[PDB]
C-alpha cells in the first residue's frame, strides 16, 4: 500500500539521472554542418497483383527480392528488378498485419488475429511452398514477427507481451513482460542480440534476449506508438507515434535527442525507416503520402507523394540503392 | 535480349491469372459483421441458419454464401482491429426491446449505435437492424411503460405504438440519410423470415454499389 511512495522517489531519482547527463541540445551541435540539399525521387518500378489493402512488407538480404502480405489472403514474393512474381502463397487467416523474409532466404513468416505466426518453407523438393509450423501461445493479435536465424524467431503480441521461440520444437524459449498495454512493433539489432519494443502505453523498452529481462525504459511521447526502427550503429532507434511526431532515442544517455514535427501536420505515422548511412529518416503518414527527414537538422529534404491512399508499410534495403512503400491502394512502389 | 528469363515470365503470367480467379470468387461469399449489446442476442443470430481469436461463420442461401465475422468477443481497443473490416458489405445490429432496465441498457446500445453509424470507416456502409426478444416486450410495457427510460414519451403503452416509437427513435440517429440507408425487422422467423430480409437488403446494397461501379448515378 504505502510502497507507492518509493516508486515516486525512484522515478524522481531516475529523472535526475537521465537529466544531469544533458548539456548538448543536439540541434545546437550541428550549427556548422552543410545540409543535405534537396532530394527528389522517381518511381522507378511499380508492382501490381494485389486486389485489396496490403499491411506490411520486408526485403531480402540480397537487396533484390521482397515479400508482401495482403487482406485478399495472399503473401507474394517479388523480384524487384523485373516486377516478376516468384511465389504466391495462399493464407488461412486474411486478417494479416505482419510478414518477414529470413536472411538465409529459405523461410518466411506471417501472422495476424489468429494469434499464430505461421512459418513457411520456400526451398523444398516436391516443388511447392509448404507451411512448416504454426506457433501458438498468445492471446492477442500478432503485430510484428522478426527472425534471428533459420531456427529462432521473435514475436510481439497485443496481450502486452513478447516472446522468443524455437521452431523444431515450437515452445516459447523466452517470454518478455513489463508492458501495460498493446505492443504494436519490434526491431532487431544488427548484432541480433538485443531487440526493442514500443507499445500503445506511450512507452518503449530495450530488452535482452539471452537473459530475458528488460534493460531500459523510454518515454517522451504524449500519445500511443505505431512504429519503430534502429540506427545502423545499434546505438539508437526511432519511434513513430500517432501524435504526428517522430523521435530519436539513444541507448547510452537514456533520453530523446530530436523531435520531428511541423505545425502543418496533424495525421498519424504508420511506418519508419533509416538509410544505410543514417542520414535520412523516412516516415509514412496517413495523409495518403509519405515524407523524408534529415536526422541531424530536423528539417525535411523531400517528399514521395505518389500514392492515392494511406502508406501502411515501408522499408529500405541493405545495399542502399532503393526504397519501398506499401499502400492501401494495393500498389507497391520502388523509388531510388 | 532474353534467354531463360522468358520462362520466368510464363510463370508471372499464370500467377496473376490464378490470383484473379481467386479474387473473382470472393464476391459470391459476402461478408457481414454481427454486433450486439452486452451478451444480448449474439447467440441465435448466428445459428439462424445451420449450413481461435476472431469468430468466423458460414451459411448458404440461394447460391449466396454469407460469412458473419462476429467480433463481439475480442478484448482490445474498439479501433486497432476495426479498420480491418472496411470494405465489408453491411453491418448487423441486434438489440433487445425490453432489457432497457437491466444494468440503462438501451442507453448503452444508443451510445454504441452513435459510435458506429458515424465512424470514419462506416460512412457508406449500410446497416441492418434487428429487434429481438419481442414477445416479452409485450408485457414489460403492459406493466412498466418505457417512460422509465424515456420519460419524454407519452402514448399507448402497447406493442403497436411503443415498438414503432423505439423503431423510429433508432432509425433517426444517422447524421446523414442520403448516402447510407438503415433497415428494420423483428425476430419472428417461421424458421426462415429474417435471413430472407438479409438476402433482400444485401442484394439491394450490391445494386447500390454496382450503380456507382458503373457511373449510372
Amino acid at each position: 500500500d504505502q510502497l507507492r511512495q518509493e516508486a515516486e522517489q525512484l522515478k524522481n531519482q531516475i529523472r535526475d539521472a537521465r537529466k544531469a547527463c544533458a548539456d548538448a541540445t543536439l540541434s545546437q551541435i550541428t550549427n556548422n554542418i552543410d545540409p543535405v540539399g534537396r532530394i527528389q525521387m522517381r518511381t522507378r518500378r511499380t508492382l501490381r497483383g494485389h486486389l485489396a489493402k496490403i499491411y506490411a512488407m520486408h526485403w531480402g538480404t540480397d537487396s533484390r527480392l521482397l515479400v508482401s502480405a495482403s487482406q485478399d489472403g495472399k503473401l507474394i514474393i517479388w523480384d524487384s528488378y523485373t516486377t516478376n512474381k516468384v511465389h504466391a502463397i495462399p493464407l488461412r487467416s486474411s486478417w494479416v498485419m505482419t510478414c518477414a523474409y529470413a536472411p538465409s532466404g529459405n523461410y518466411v513468416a506471417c501472422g495476424g488475429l489468429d494469434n499464430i505466426c505461421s512459418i513457411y518453407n520456400l526451398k523444398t523438393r516436391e516443388g511447392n511452398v509448404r507451411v512448416s509450423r504454426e506457433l501458438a501461445g498468445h492471446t492477442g493479435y500478432l503485430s510484428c514477427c522478426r527472425f534471428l536465424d533459420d531456427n529462432q524467431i521473435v514475436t510481439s503480441s497485443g496481450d502486452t507481451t513478447c516472446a522468443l521461440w524455437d521452431i523444431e520444437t515450437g515452445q516459447q524459449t523466452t517470454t518478455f513482460t513489463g508492458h501495460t498495454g498493446d505492443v504494436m512493433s519490434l526491431s532487431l539489432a544488427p548484432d541480433t542480440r538485443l531487440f526493442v519494443s514500443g507499445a500503445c502505453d506511450a512507452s518503449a523498452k530495450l530488452w535482452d534476449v539471452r537473459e530475458g529481462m528488460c534493460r531500459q525504459t523510454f518515454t517522451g511521447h504524449e500519445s500511443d506508438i505505431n512504429a519503430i526502427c534502429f540506427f545502423p550503429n545499434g546505438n539508437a532507434f526511432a519511434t513513430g507515434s500517432d501524435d504526428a511526431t517522430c523521435r530519436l532515442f539513444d541507448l547510452r544517455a537514456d533520453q530523446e535527442l530530436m523531435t520531428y514535427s511541423h505545425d502543418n501536420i496533424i495525421c498519424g505515422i504508420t511506418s519508419v525507416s533509416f538509410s544505410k548511412s543514417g542520414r535520412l529518416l523516412l516516415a509514412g503518414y496517413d495523409d495518403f503520402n509519405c515524407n523524408v527527414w534529415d536526422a541531424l537538422k530536423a528539417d525535411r529534404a523531400g517528399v514521395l507523394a505518389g500514392h492515392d491512399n494511406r502508406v501502411s508499410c515501408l522499408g529500405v534495403t541493405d545495399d542502399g540503392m532503393a526504397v519501398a512503400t506499401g499502400s492501401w491502394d494495393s500498389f507497391l512502389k520502388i523509388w531510388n | 535480349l532474353s534467354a531463360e528469363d522468358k520462362a520466368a515470365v510464363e510463370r508471372s503470367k499464370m500467377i496473376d491469372r490464378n490470383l484473379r480467379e481467386d479474387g473473382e470468387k470472393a464476391a459470391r461469399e459476402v461478408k457481414l459483421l454481427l454486433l450486439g449489446a452486452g451478451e444480448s442476442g449474439k447467440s441465435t443470430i448466428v445459428k439462424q441458419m445451420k449450413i481461435t481469436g476472431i469468430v468466423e461463420t458460414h451459411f448458404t442461401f440461394k447460391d449466396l454464401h454469407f460469412k458473419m465475422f462476429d467480433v463481439g468477443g475480442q478484448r482490445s481497443e474498439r479501433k486497432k482491429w476495426i479498420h480491418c473490416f472496411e470494405g465489408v458489405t453491411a453491418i448487423i445490429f441486434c438489440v433487445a426491446l425490453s432489457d432497457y432496465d437491466l444494468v440503462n441498457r438501451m442507453h448503452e446500445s444508443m451510445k454504441l449505435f452513435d459510435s458506429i453509424c458515424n465512424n470514419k470507416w462506416f460512412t457508406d456502409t449500410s446497416i441492418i437492424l434487428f429487434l429481438n426478444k419481442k414477445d416479452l416486450f409485450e408485457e414489460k410495457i403492459k406493466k412498466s411503460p418505457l417512460t422509465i427510460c424515456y420519460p419524454e414519451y407519452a402514448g399507448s403503452n402497447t406493442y403497436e405504438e411503443a415498438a414503432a416509437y423505439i423503431q423510429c427513435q433508432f432509425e433517426d440517429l444517422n447524421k446523414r440519410k442520403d448516402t447510407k440507408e438503415i433497415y428494420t425487422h423483428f425476430t419472428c422467423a417461421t424458421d426462415t423470415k429474417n435471413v430472407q430480409f438479409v438476402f433482400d437488403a444485401v442484394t439491394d446494397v450490391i445494386i447500390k454499389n454496382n450503380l456507382k461501379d458503373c457511373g449510372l448515378f
Epitope: 526451398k123 516443388g127 511447392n128 | 534467354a3 520462362a7 510463370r11
Partner: single-chain antibody, 232 residues
Framework: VQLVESGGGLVQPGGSRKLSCSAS????????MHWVRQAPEKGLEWVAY????????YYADTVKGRFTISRDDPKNTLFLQMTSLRSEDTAMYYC??????????????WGQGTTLTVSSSDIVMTQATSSVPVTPGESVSISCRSS???????????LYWFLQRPGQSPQLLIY???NLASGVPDRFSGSGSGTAFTLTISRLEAEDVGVYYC?????????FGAGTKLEL
C-alpha cells in the same frame, strides 16, 4: 522423388511409337520437362521442351514434324509420340525436370529412361578429352570450351556440368558455371569465362568415376560435349 518412363522396345523402321513418363512426388504442373537422349556409346542430345501451362514447345532441328510432345497435368503424365522412325533414332531416352525462377536449379532430377532400338547456327561445345587415368587423392580439372560467349548481359554464365556413373543415370553437379547443387559436397567446383571452363575436384574418391558432361542453356537448341571419361 520418382520419374519412371515406359514405352521403349523394338520396332521396325518406318513405324511409330509412344513413350510415357509417370511422376510421383512433386507439383508436376509447375515444372518444365525435357526429353534428353543418349546412344549406346556416344553423348547426350536434347530433343524437346514443354513448359508450365503447355503454352510453349521447342524441338531439335533434326526432328520437327514427326516427334510430338504432350502433357496431361492431372494424371501427372508426360508423352512423346514418334512417327517415321530411322536408325539414327536408336537410343535411350530420359524424362527430366526443369523449374525456372530466380534462384532455381534446373536439371535437378533425371529419371532412368527407356531404350528404343531398330534394325538397319547452333552453338558447339568442344569436349576434347576422352580418358584420364587417376588414383585416389588426385585433384583433377576438366575442360569445356565453346564456340561463342555463354555469358548473357544480365550477369550470368549459362553453362552446366553433369555426371553419369555406369549403369546409372545423370546427376547434376553445377549450374551456371559457379553454383553448386544440393546433394553434393564441397569437393566440386567450376570457373572460367567465354569459351573457357574448368571443373575442379579435391580429394577424389570412388563413386566419382564416370563420364562428366557439359551443356549450355543460353539459347535453344541445347548442345552437349562428347564424354570426358575418368578412369583409374
Amino acid at each position: 522423388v520418382q520419374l519412371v518412363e515406359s514405352g521403349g522396345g523394338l520396332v521396325q523402321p518406318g513405324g511409330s511409337r509412344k513413350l510415357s513418363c509417370s511422376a510421383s512426388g512433386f507439383a508436376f504442373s509447375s515444372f518444365g520437362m525435357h526429353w534428353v537422349r543418349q546412344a549406346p556409346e556416344k553423348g547426350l542430345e536434347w530433343v524437346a521442351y514443354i513448359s508450365s501451362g503447355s503454352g510453349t514447345i521447342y524441338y531439335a532441328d533434326t526432328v520437327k514434324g514427326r516427334f510430338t510432345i504432350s502433357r496431361d497435368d492431372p494424371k501427372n503424365t508426360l508423352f512423346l509420340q514418334m512417327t517415321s522412325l530411322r536408325s539414327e533414332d536408336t537410343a535411350m531416352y530420359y524424362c527430366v525436370r526443369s523449374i525456372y525462377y530466380y534462384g532455381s536449379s534446373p536439371f535437378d532430377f533425371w529419371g532412368q529412361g527407356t531404350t528404343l532400338t531398330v534394325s538397319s547456327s547452333d552453338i558447339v561445345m568442344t569436349q576434347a578429352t576422352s580418358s584420364v587415368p587417376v588414383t585416389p587423392g588426385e585433384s583433377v580439372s576438366i575442360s569445356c570450351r565453346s564456340s561463342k560467349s555463354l555469358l548473357h548481359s544480365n550477369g550470368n554464365t549459362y553453362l552446366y556440368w553433369f555426371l553419369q556413373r555406369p549403369g546409372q543415370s545423370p546427376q547434376l553437379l553445377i549450374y551456371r558455371m559457379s553454383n553448386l547443387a544440393s546433394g553434393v559436397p564441397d569437393r566440386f567446383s567450376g570457373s572460367g569465362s567465354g569459351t573457357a571452363f574448368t571443373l575442379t575436384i579435391s580429394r577424389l574418391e570412388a563413386e566419382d568415376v564416370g563420364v562428366y558432361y557439359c551443356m549450355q542453356h543460353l539459347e535453344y537448341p541445347l548442345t552437349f560435349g562428347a564424354g570426358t571419361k575418368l578412369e583409374l
